[PDB]
Structure 1
């Protein structure tokens, strides 16, 4: 009754969920699916209660009646007077990243190059960059723009999955979950870092969190921010320090969604759970931390300070914003459980 069933995407999130379940004393239980879309279906069926989603999926879930409940909030400089849970969200910056050594590569010479995407249907990894490319190109053949890519969620036989690597054994190539080596923010950046692709579509934070000794991960240990450059829409290339004047767009933060009829209950439980395992939670450092998973961003992004209330009880369209909503709609024109 007062119990919440979380939906984990893939085996790694499932294992973290199980630890959360155990430490929560069954207040939180786990359901697992192989893809985010499958988790959305479980929630619609009522077999799972909620999960944290990127804005691109919130659009999909929203057309099916699911609503945003609480949003990820990262530590910001401005609005320091208010508490995190009550602080308004600022959104993150979607950027296009390349290696400095790849001189001459600009936004205007991306055609026929190799790309790394977080996953199909995600904000920074797909919707924003492909939406821009389709317009500037006046063509819906976004599957023919880059020569090869790793875009988890696309046809494993297509060029859009040619660069994906699968798991340790080569299985699950291009699956849209953490089993795929180049999945998500971290995976797409790794795809660029190992020179598998020429450009990576991720967010500003990803670059900083995986460079200059911030990761300790084998592939990221020797990465330096100076060896990277951001591609601006004006054909320019800039240092990663200038993301505020060189990004593709500002994206709405990932947020927890649930069926409307379960929203109130999910919100209540989550607020109590973060008070216990959140950043300054009673048991985070010592026993369990909800927002930690060694740079793998499992269940929640690792840079999350807290889950914040929304204020203005927004619908999914108000949460995403008219700007972003129409962008997705237009891109979708090129392409139950598709509920609209």
Structure 2
């Protein structure tokens, strides 16, 4: 058989990947790159096999010929009798989150406010909110909309990176990897929690997972759900319990992608690796947990119960959904079928 070469984005993911590799008996090994796009390029070159991607990155990867293999499946209600690996995914809720204390901030007064984004090109953090904003403002100048932002992956000298903080030393400001303090779901929510931004573009789960003691992290320790609100598209504000009626979109779950020629083997290896290291995994938590990273969502989201089989052997467009694909396409006209590499 062959080994599977995972691609880790940044040095923290690399550390986790190297643990996984050690525990896997080298069935999985690790390549690393600085950005998700660079990992995609490694995969395209055949120098890595696979990584797990947000839907916006799935679009990039898809255009370049990479295919979805398995999807993250979090806890559900529905389809409650089937195994996680066979339970249909549900998709996560992209939300706009503000402080309750920031009274009178709504969707319609976001202009010239400070924003926190997971990263450029990600679903909840970018594609959905900026796609909506471009459409409603009828302008492609999404780079001049918020007074300041943290939008990892944007030009570090620009207003879209002005709120980003980098790493301990204050290097890597605005890089789109976990070295950036305000990267990703948990980083963007932290940017809001610390009042660096006025609004965070994250998902519903992020808010719950980092409040009311669900996170023991210093910046999250003491956060309370009731101190946050969601911005609905109709201009109202709701408690974070109302995400099902106050979201920006429903997003397709992050999913593993590979070259088509390696998909079957990546799939088999992953199904076995999560049997060992997944949620009820034979050797998790004693040895290693693939879906834990102390809240940092490294390699996979920490709320992943399993990687689930896809159904209909879907193309990247089918997996993302035609509506989301066209929304992305429309947005990218601002910055039209390619491989961008």
- For normalisation by structure 2, the TM-score amounts to 0.99
CA distance 1:137–1:336, shift in 2 (3 Å): closer
Gaps of 5+ in 1: none
Question: Is the contact made by 1:21 and 1:28 (CA closer than 8 Å) also made in structure 2?
Answer: yes
Check whether the contact 2:329–2:336 (CA below 8 A) recurs between aligned residues. Answer: no
Whole-Å Cα distance in 2 between the matches of residues 322 and 339 of structure 1? 18
On the 8 A contact 1:8/1:30 being kept in 2, the answer is yes
User: Distance in 2 between the 1:151 and 1:66 partners?
Assistant: 25
Deviation, structure 1 residue 206: 0.1
Aligned mates of 1:193, 1:339 — CA distance in 2: 37
Q: Is the CA contact 2:116–2:188 (under 8 Å) kept in the aligned structure 1? A: yes
Give 1:165 deviation, angstroms: 0.1
Check the 8 A contact 1:97/1:202 in 2, yes or no.
yes
Task: State how many pairs are aligned.
Answer: 340
Equivalents in 2 of 1:32, 1:228: separation in Å? 36
1:81-106: CA deviation from partner (whole Å, max 9, x where unpaired): 11100011100000000000000000
CA distance in 2, matches of 1:265, 1:78: 30
Check the 8 A contact 1:166/1:180 in 2, yes or no: yes
Contact 1:2 1:269 in 2 (8 A): no
Query: What's the offset of the Cα at 1:62?
Result: 0.2
SS in 1 for 2:330: helix
Deviations 1:169-208 (A, max 9, x none): 0000000000000000000000000000000000000000
Aligned-residue Cα RMSD (Å) equals: 1.1
Runs of 4+ that moved beyond 2 A:
none
Hey, what's the Cα distance between the residues in 2 that align with 1:311 and 1:117?
Answer: 31
Deviations 1:147-174 (A, max 9, x none): 0000000000100000000000000000
Q: Deviations over 1:9-63 (max 9, x none)?
A: 0000000000000000000000000000000000011010000000000000000
CA-to-aligned-CA distance 1:207-256 (integer Å, 9 cap, x gap):
00000000000000110000000000000000000000000000000000
Conservation of the 8 A alpha-carbon contact between 1:57 and 1:122: yes
Q: Distance in 2 between matches of 1:71 and 1:204?
A: 18
Q: Distance in 2 between matches of 1:21 and 1:5?
A: 9
1:256-315 CA-partner distances (Å, limit 9, x unpaired): 000001001100100000000011111011110000001100000000000000010000
Tell me, what secondary structure is at the counterpart of 1:160?
Answer: helix
Maintained 8 Å contact 2:51/2:257: yes
The answer as to whether partners of 1:41 and 1:337 remain within 8 angstroms in 2 is no
**Shift of residue 337 of structure 1?**
11
**Structure 2 SS opposite 1:124:** helix
In 2: Cα distance, 1:337 partner to 1:188 partner: 30
Residues 94-121 of structure 1 show CA distances to partners (whole Å, capped at 9, x for unaligned) of 0000000000000000000000000000
Other structure's SS at 2:30 match: strand
Distance in 1, matches of 2:339 and 2:274, equals 32
Q: Is the 8 A contact 1:211 1:225 kept in 2?
A: yes
After alignment, is 328-337 or 317-326 more displaced?
328-337
How far the C-alpha of 1:339 sits from its partner, in A, is 1.5
> C-alpha deviations, 1:116-150, integer Å up to 9, x for none?
00000000000000000000000000000000000
TM-score of the aligned structures, taking structure 1 as reference length: 0.99
Q: CA deviation at 1:2?
A: 2.1
Instruction: Give the 3-state SS of the residue equivalent to 1:130 in structure 2.
Output: helix
Q: Distance in 2 between matches of 1:337 and 1:49?
A: 23
* Mean Cα deviation higher: 330-339 or 48-57: 330-339
